[PDB]
């Protein structure tokens, strides 16, 4: 058993500390107008203090292709990790596991901090409100829980009779949408825990749901081949559109914060991108996942860059407008990657796989020979 009462030798842990990068960026912004005034980082190990966070290198999103392994964070329970989410300030990483527990890992040195039995059933959904107060989680039993930064459960109610796959907040966080295996999306009032509407029409398990960044639009993905993607009006409850985008089981639908793009991952090995203003024609199609595409994550800083996870354990990186993958690791995990979470500074990526571990990936050091197992 582990209770914080066992003596062990002091350990100095591996760190990915963003503070030197921010300080360097704070100095450069003073005298550098933008990227074109930025002095080049040399591909040498001695140029360690010239690094800046992704906000510094806006013209080159290739910095945030995080294929440098940092640490593997595994619980002693050894159960699959279904969702990973960063605390809104990046202080901690929270993982939802099949055991129903929340595990907290320190955001600087990725070591265990605390664990709590959050849900009775596996934790399937975990989302933070746009204001940093609220973290909403859902489980395979159909219950939705309200949490705060101090990881104190505040409200509990059963939203669905079946497994809730994903939840998404409205911009003002007054309402949120949940998708379930019962085949319906449901719009909820956060403060009263009351379902405003029930959104029906998919005809099979709804595996993903996303709220539009500003408009008031709900996009859903389902197992149903006839209704793979649907667009909804959360107020009226009506189906605005149906998108026959994938052959099999759309697993993720993520709307880019620019408000224009819909990112879809599916079991047909494909990630597709769409313009919600023009839904008849599909935008770029992303190919390169040998097995199913299971997780996607838009980069918080670079609006065209996103990471993708696969059922084989591959973790690939793509950019909008680039046909091929900008980077990737074919054997990032030994099992299906369920979730990808970016640090608020998009310098660290975390992945939680169907294997009982979660891994942290950072940007590659300038001047290193990427001859490790994950690169070469």
């Amino acid at each position: 058993t582990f209770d914080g009462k066992r003596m062990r030798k002091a350990v100095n842990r591996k760190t990915i500390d963003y503070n030197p990068s921010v300080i360097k960026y704070l100095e450069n912004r003073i005298w550098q107008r933008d990227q074109r005034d930025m002095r080049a980082i040399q591909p040498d190990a001695g140029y360690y203090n010239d690094l800046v966070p992704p906000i510094g290198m806006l013209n080159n999103p290739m910095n945030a292709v995080t294929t440098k392994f940092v640490r593997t964070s595994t619980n002693k329970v050894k159960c699959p990790v279904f969702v990973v989410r960063w605390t809104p300030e990046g202080r901690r990483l929270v993982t939802g596991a099949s055991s129903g527990e929340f595990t907290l890992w320190n955001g600087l040195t990725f070591n265990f901090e605390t664990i709590l039995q959050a849900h009775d059933s596996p934790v399937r959904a975990m989302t933070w409100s746009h204001n940093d107060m609220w973290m909403l989680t859902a489980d395979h039993g159909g219950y939705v829980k309200y949490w705060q930064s101090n990881m104190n459960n505040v409200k509990m109610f059963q939203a669905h009779k079946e497994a809730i796959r994903e939840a998404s907040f409205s911009p003002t966080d007054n309402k949120f949408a949940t998708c379930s295996d019962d085949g319906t999306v449901r719009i909820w009032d956060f403060l009263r825990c009351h379902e405003e509407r029930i959104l029906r029409g998919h005809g099979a398990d709804v595996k993903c749901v996303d709220w539009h960044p500003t408009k008031g639009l709900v996009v859903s993905g389902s197992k149903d081949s006839q209704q793979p993607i649907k667009f909804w009006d959360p107020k009226t409850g009506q189906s605005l559109a149906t998108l026959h985008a994938h052959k099999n089981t759309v697993m993720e639908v993520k709307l880019n914060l620019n408000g224009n793009w819909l990112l879809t991952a599916s079991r047909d090995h494909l990630c597709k991108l769409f313009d919600i203003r023009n839904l008849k024609e599909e935008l770029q199609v992303f190919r390169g996942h040998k097995k199913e595409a299971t997780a996607v994550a838009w980069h918080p800083v670079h609006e065209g860059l996103f990471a993708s996870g696969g059922s084989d354990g591959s973790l690939l990186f793509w950019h909008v407008g680039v046909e091929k993958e900008v980077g990737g690791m074919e054997m990032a995990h030994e099992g299906m990657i369920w979730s990808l979470a970016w640090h608020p500074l998009g310098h660290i990526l975390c992945s939680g796989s169907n294997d009982h571990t979660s891994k942290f990936w950072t940007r590659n050091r300038p001047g290193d020979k990427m001859r490790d197992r994950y690169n070469l």
Partner: protein
């Protein structure tokens, strides 16, 4: 120089100064479960009665607490107003180190918990 000298504001009574003193626009705390330990101390509750037991957004504090809250430093204080440990940054009030008191000498000299010897 010294903006405090050339541009003094002590003679000015700002609106938000009145707003926080009068607890202005403070809606009752929903969801009785939560605590909001990063909130201000209720000055109305200190003088006499606030009228919102647990529903007040602000902290209703008590003076019997002597040891600082170890979870509050880590940002994981679930108890909130019903917490027996002081939410203050007094180093003298830090709890005694579990490892220095029992397991001989503590591993890191940088720990904040008090060492007795």
């Amino acid at each position: 120089g010294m903006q405090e000298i050339i541009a003094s504001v002590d003679h000015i009574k700002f609106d938000l100064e009145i707003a926080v003193e009068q607890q202005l626009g403070a809606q009752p705390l929903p969801f009785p479960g939560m605590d909001k330990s990063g909130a201000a101390v209720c000055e109305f509750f200190l003088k006499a009665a606030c009228g919102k037991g647990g529903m007040c957004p602000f902290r209703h504090i008590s003076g019997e607490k002597t040891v600082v809250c170890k979870h509050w430093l880590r940002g994981l204080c679930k108890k909130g107003d019903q917490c027996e440990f002081l939410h203050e940054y007094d180093m003298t009030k830090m709890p005694e180190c579990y490892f220095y008191s029992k397991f001989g000498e503590c591993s890191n000299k940088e720990c904040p918990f008090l060492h007795i010897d």
